[PDB]
C-alpha cells in the first residue's frame, strides 16, 4: 500500500488484558516507510517489559514504546520512525489486567520514495542519474547511448 | 498518457536542429502530482528575451535559449522548473537558418507529489495526512471519520 492505519485492539477505548497482536506493513519496492504514532497511552513499566508497542524492521527492533505521551501544537505526532525498508512489523502486548484502562495507540504509515541517486555511497549510473517516484533511470551525455545494463553509457 | 517521468529531446538531437521548424510536446503526470522539468543540455541560438530560436515552457512558465552546460557529473541541470500542476507544454522553435549548427536541448521531467495538506482550503476537519499521490483525513481519539471521508464526529 502507499499508506495505512494501525490501531490497538479496542482503540480508542481501553485495550484488552493479556493479549498480543501483530501487524505486518508492506509498501512497494522503491519506497521506504514513515511510521508515526498519533496516540500513545500504554501502562508505563521499566524498559516497557510489560505492556508495550514494538516496531521491528527484521530481527531488529527499531523501537519499543510505552507510557503516556502527547505531542508540537501543530502536529499530533508523538513518536515517529523513518525506515529505508519496504516492510515493517508492529507488535502490541498487554500483560495482566488493564485496571487503569489505558487506551493503547494509533499509528499511521506512508510510503516514502527512495532516492536511488543520492541515498547511497555510489551513484547507480556511470553518468546521469534521474530519480523518480518508485524508481530511477540513468541517462547519458549527447552522442552517447545507454548500454543494455541500463547503467553504463558508451559511444559508437 | 499520464506518466511518472519522461525525456524530451530537440528535433535531430544530438545533432544540429533543423532550420525553420516548430515542435511541441505535451507532458502529463497523474492527478495528485506536480512536475519537475529540468534541462541537461542547452545549445540554442542566443537572442535577447529569446525572441528567435527558443524553448518555451507553458502551463508561460519560462523561455530559454543560448548555450550553457553543467560540470555536475551525475546531475547536470542548467535550467529547471517546478510546477504544482499535472500538465505542461514544451514548445521548441527554430527560425531562419541554423548556420551555427546549434544542437538544441535535452530535458527530463518527473512527477512530484503534491502535499494537499499544506497547499489554502483545508481538506480535513481535523488531521490531514499527506501521502504519495493523495492524502487522507483522520480524527482525534473517540471521534470517527464520517462517510464523506473528511469530517470527524461523535455519536
Ligand atoms: Ca526513487
Ligand atoms: Ca499527496
Ligand atoms: Mg498491563
Ligand atoms: Mg534562428
From Swiss-Prot, chain A:
Protein source organism: Homo sapiens
Domain named CUB: residues: 1-112
Domain EGF-like: 113-154
Modified residues ((3R)-3-hydroxyasparagine): 131
Gene that encodes the chain: C1S
Name by which UniProt lists this protein: Complement C1s subcomponent heavy chain
Residues the record lists as binding Ca(2+) 2: 113-114, 116, 131-132, 135
Disulfide bonds: 48-66, 117-129, 125-138, 140-153
Residues that bind Ca(2+) 1: 43, 51, 95
Glycosylation site positions: 156
Curated annotation (Swiss-Prot), chain B:
Binding-site residues for Ca(2+) 2, renumbered to this chain: 113-114, 116, 130-131, 134
Residues reported to bind Ca(2+) 1: 45, 53, 95
Occurrences of domain EGF-like (ranges): 113-153
Part of the full-length chain shown: 16 to 174 of 688
UniProt organism field: Homo sapiens (Human)
UniProt-reported outcome of changing residue 48 to A: Does not affect association with the C1Q subcomplex
PTM-bearing positions, type (3R)-3-hydroxyasparagine: 130
Glycosylation sites: 155
Tree of life domain: Eukaryota
Protein name: Complement C1s subcomponent heavy chain
Lineage: Eukaryota, Metazoa, Chordata, Craniata, Vertebrata
Domain CUB: start-end pairs: 1-112
Disulfide bonding pattern of the chain: 50-65, 117-128, 124-137, 139-152
Effect of residue 95 to A: Slightly decreased association with the C1Q subcomplex
Amino acid at each position: 500500500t502507499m499508506y495505512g492505519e494501525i490501531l490497538s485492539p479496542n482503540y480508542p477505548q481501553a485495550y484488552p488484558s493479556e493479549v498480543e497482536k501483530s501487524w505486518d506493513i508492506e509498501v512497494p519496492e522503491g519506497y521506504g516507510i514513515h511510521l508515526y504514532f498519533t496516540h500513545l497511552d500504554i501502562e508505563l513499566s521499566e524498559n516497557c517489559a510489560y505492556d508495550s508497542v514494538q516496531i521491528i524492521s527484521g530481527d531488529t527492533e527499531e523501537g519499543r514504546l510505552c507510557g503516556q505521551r502527547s505531542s508540537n501544537p501543530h502536529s499530533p505526532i508523538v513518536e515517529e520512525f523513518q525506515v529505508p525498508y519496504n516492510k515493517l512489523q508492529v507488535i502490541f502486548k498487554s500483560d495482566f489486567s488493564n485496571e487503569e484502562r489505558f487506551t493503547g495507540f494509533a499509528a499511521y504509515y506512508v510510503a516514502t520514495d527512495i532516492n536511488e541517486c543520492t541515498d547511497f555511497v555510489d551513484v547507480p549510473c556511470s553518468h546521469f542519474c534521474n530519480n523518480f517516484i518508485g524508481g530511477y533511470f540513468c541517462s547519458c551525455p549527447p552522442e552517447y547511448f545507454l548500454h543494455d545494463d541500463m547503467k553504463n553509457c558508451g559511444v559508437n
